[PDB]
């Protein structure tokens, strides 16, 4: 293990870290530890552990204050630091988060891009991160982002594989599952919601928000569509209705109107998630709080704003003398934020540089988590200086696709198509004329084949026939057309490849990301557990 550690240190010292400039390792002082005034309170995690998920729902319904979900550990660093936040810093502050802020409804620390990114770039197992954080935070409810039938991947998976992931993740410590479909299709969500209910955890059925409900010129996603979707999601027995504003498109007037209309539609508590990209995130949460939203998603101030969540410390003072307060220890949250400000300086190579709010997001509707990666993807392909060009193409491709809901994995499809169009200098009537000779990206082809489900209003018929030439097109759930994976045969071949008997979490990781998990195991054999190094040593040797 010392040999592997010295091997990694020498490799990074000599050849640099992949994907960043081989800069000098700056001397960092130790991050500031919080000084906390601890109050022993009963949390929602305790209610779930003792009385169950329905009692957590009743406790949320009986809370007059708005509850807070901390997205610092997943979404804040996904939006700002390209998901590169390492378990070392999280474990530096995890106990202080669990004790100093027991008023949090949950902490979003898993799922989304973290599962892919930890394995691929950080060379640490997300299951290991979940275990370490679960040990460090026993009284904090753990929330994960689950992309329905797409799981933590970008493609459809069979239903038994989804159920196995939900079982293993619930056993490992995930308590709240935020389940969403990229195209807001209920059949993609039903099996995941049922599996979460069967595992005794909290199922959050999510409505992805797009467009403007207060704009009469855009009637595709109006208020009646969202109300019907909410009623259908309430029929599935999900515990909490979630509303994902992934690009920060929910205006505060719309936020009041949408939440109030959802409250008289369904009896579920409403969990609102938005990004502060337009700069209106705080006033959107204020509008939803006046409308009676139950839980909102906030981040610590040093990792908030921009494409990330609205600030947890800011939302306290925004609601400080209103009818509803935010349920948080604001003095403990400010002390915890001192740590997060210090460790953010470690991730300077991954800084987006997004210094200003953009109201242009109301036009292109790029999700906050996709803002950095789509720009970095243009840099790798050589059009990174043309980001505003691909942002305009992102608007056009969404219109060509039929004004779809853009969120992972559907936003990746629009991002890949927009990058492919600019790289080849294509335009809208050009793909309609020359698309037969053109070779579209695999994500675009699979999306029009139906791998991501059926969009609202269906695909455009002419564009679909151009994009998929002779491949089979399905009109139903892609999970019905996925072969059931036998976990015994997968465990046998994985043991042969990695040299030891894998766990249930390791078998599931091999099904989610076969090449990525195998590449992670090879680096583990070469460099060992590099997650134990601090971030400047991990990044600069």
Ligand X SMILES: O=C([O-])CC(=O)C(=O)O
| Cβ–Cβ < 8 Å for 481, 471 | no
Question: How many CB atoms are located within 10 Å of the residue 135 CB?
Answer: 12
Q: How far is the CB of 154 from ligand BTN (least distance, A)?
A: 7
CA-to-CA dists, residue 168 to 91, 172, 173, 202, 345, angstroms: 22, 6, 9, 15, 34
Task: Select 75 or 124, whichever has its Cβ closest to Mn ion.
Answer: 75
Regarding 377 and contact with a second copy (CB under 8 A), the answer is: yes
Report helix, strand or coil for 356: coil
Is 407 a residue that touches ligand X (CB under 6 A)?
Answer: yes
Q: Which residues pair with 145 in a beta bridge?
A: 111, 178
Which partner from the list ligand BTN, Mn ion, a second copy, none does 441 bind, CB cut-off 5 to 8 Å by kind?
a second copy
Cβ(149)–Cβ(452) below 8 Å: no
The yes or no reply on residue 369 touching ligand BTN (CB under 6 A) is yes
CA-CA distance, 517 to 300, in Å (whole number)? 31
d(CA 231, CA 246): 21
Residue 296, φ and ψ in degrees, nearest 5: -130, 155
The residue sitting closest to ligand X, measured at its beta carbon, is 369
Burial of 16 (0-12, 13-18, 19+ CB in 10 A): middle
Residue 424 binds to a second copy (criterion: CB under 8 A): yes
- Shortest reach from residue 188's CB to ligand BTN, in Å: 16
Of 89, 164, 294, 416, the one binding Mg ion (CB under 5 A) is: 294
Instruction: Count CA atoms closer than 13 A to 30's CA, side-chain side.
Output: 5
**Interaction between residue 81 and ligand X (CB under 6 A):** no
CB closer to ligand BTN, 160 vs 423: 423
The entry of ligand BTN, Mg ion, ligand X, none near residue 63 (CB within 5 to 8 angstroms by kind) is Mg ion
Single residue of 357, 441, 460, 536 touching a second copy by CB under 8 A:
441
416 makes contact, choosing from Mn ion, ligand BTN, ligand X, none, with CB < 5 to 8 Å by partner type, with none
Binding map of Mn ion across residues 54-83, x = CB under 5 A, - = no contact:
---------------------x--------
Q: Could you tell me the two tokens for 283? A: 């006033």
Q: Residue 321 CB, nearest distance to ligand X (Å)?
A: 33
Give CA–CA dist 313/420, Å, rounded.
41
Residue from 352, 381, 485, 490 in contact with a second copy (CB under 8 A): 381
**What is the full DSSP assignment across 90-122?**
HHHHHHHHHHH-TT-SEEEEEETTHHHHIIIII
State which residue, 415 or 541, has the beta carbon closest to ligand BTN.
Answer: 415
Element (H, E) at 77: helix 77-80
Nearest-angstrom CA–CA distance, 162 and 239: 19
Question: Residue 373 Cβ, how far from ligand BTN at the closest point, in Å?
Answer: 5
Q: Which does 117 bind (CB under 5 to 8 A by kind): Mn ion, ligand BTN, Mg ion, none?
A: ligand BTN
Instruction: Examine residue 248 and tell whether it contacts ligand BTN (CB under 6 A).
Output: no
Nearest Cα to Cα of residue 65 among 330, 333, 329, 327: 327
Number of residues near Mg ion (by CB under 5 A): 2
DSSP 473: -
Residue of 250, 241, 240, 156 lying closest to 207 (CA atoms)? 241
Residue 297 as a binder of Mg ion (CB under 5 A): the answer is no
Q: Does 442 bind a second copy (CB under 8 A)?
A: yes
Tell which positions 462-521 bind Mg ion, by CB under 5 A.
none
Q: Which is nearer to a second copy, 359 or 439 (CB)?
A: 439
Helix, strand or coil, per DSSP, at residue 298: strand
Any contact of residue 50 with a second copy (CB under 8 A)?
A: no
Q: Give the binding site for ligand X (CB under 6 A).
A: 78, 112-113, 145, 147, 246, 367, 369-370, 407-408
Q: Give the binding site for Mg ion (CB under 5 A).
A: 63, 294
Q: Give the binding site for a second copy (CB under 8 A).
A: 377, 380-382, 416, 419-420, 423-424, 437, 439, 441-443, 469-470
């Amino acid at each position: 293990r010392g040999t592997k550690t010295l091997h990694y240190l020498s490799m990074i010292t000599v050849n640099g870290f992949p994907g960043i400039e081989n800069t000098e390792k700056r001397h960092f002082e130790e991050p500031r530890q919080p000084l906390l005034n601890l109050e022993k309170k009963k949390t929602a995690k305790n209610i779930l552990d003792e009385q169950g998920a329905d009692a957590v729902v009743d406790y949320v319904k009986n809370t007059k204050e708005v509850l807070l979900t901390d997205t610092t550990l997943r979404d804040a660093h996904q939006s700002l630091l390209a998901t590169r936040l390492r378990l070392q810093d999280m474990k530096g502050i995890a106990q202080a988060i669990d004790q100093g802020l027991p008023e949090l409804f949950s902490a979003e620390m898993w799922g989304g891009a973290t599962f892919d990114v930890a394995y691929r770039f950080l060379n640490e197992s997300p299951w290991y991160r979940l275990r370490k954080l679960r040990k460090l935070m026993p009284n904090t409810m753990f929330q994960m982002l689950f992309r329905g039938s797409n799981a933590v991947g970008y493609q459809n998976y069979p239903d038994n594989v989804i159920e196995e992931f939900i079982r293993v993740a619930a056993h490992e410590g995930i308590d709240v599952f935020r389940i969403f479909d990229s195209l807001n299709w209920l059949p993609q969500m039903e099996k995941s919601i049922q599996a979460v209910r069967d595992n005794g955890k909290i199922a959050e059925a999510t409505i992805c928000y797009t467009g403007d409900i207060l704009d009469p010129s855009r009637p595709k996603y109006n208020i009646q569509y969202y109300k019907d979707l909410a009623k259908e999601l309430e029929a599935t027995g999900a515990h909490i209705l979630a509303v994902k504003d992934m690009a920060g498109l929910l205006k505060p007037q719309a936020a009041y109107r949408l939440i109030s209309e959802l409250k008289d539609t369904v009896d579920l508590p409403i969990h609102l998630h938005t990004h502060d990209t337009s700069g209106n995130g705080i006033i959107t949460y204020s509008g939803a709080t006046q409308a009676g939203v139950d839980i909102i998603d906030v981040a610590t101030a040093s990792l908030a704003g921009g494409t990330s969540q609205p600030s947890m410390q800011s939302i306290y003072y925004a609601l400080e003398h209103g009818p509803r307060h935010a349920s948080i220890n604001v003095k403990n949250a400010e002390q915890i934020d001192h740590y997060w400000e210090d460790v953010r300086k470690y991730y300077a190579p991954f800084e987006a540089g997004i210094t200003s709010p953009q109201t242009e997001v109301y036009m292109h509707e790029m999700p906050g988590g996709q803002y950095t990666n789509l720009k970095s993807q243009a840099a790798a392909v050589g059009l990174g200086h043309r980001f505003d060009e691909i942002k305009q193409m992102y608007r056009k491709v969404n219109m060509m696709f039929g004004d779809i809901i853009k969120v992972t994995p559907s936003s990746k499809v629009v991002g890949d198509m927009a990058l492919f169009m600019i790289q080849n200098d294509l335009t809208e009537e050009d793909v309609y004329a020359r698309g037969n000779e053109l070779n579209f990206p695999e994500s675009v082809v699979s999306f029009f084949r139906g791998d991501l489900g059926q969009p609202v209003g269906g695909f455009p018929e002419k564009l679909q026939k151009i994009i998929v030439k002779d491949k089979a097109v399905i009109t139903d759930r892609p999970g019905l057309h996925a072969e059931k994976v036998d976990f015994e045969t997968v465990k046998a071949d994985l043991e042969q490849k990695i040299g030891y008997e894998p766990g249930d979490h390791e078998v599931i990781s091999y099904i989610m990301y076969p090449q990525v998990f195998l590449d992670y195991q090879k680096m583990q054999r070469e460099f060992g557990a590099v997650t134990l190094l601090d971030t400047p040593t991990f990044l600069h040797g």
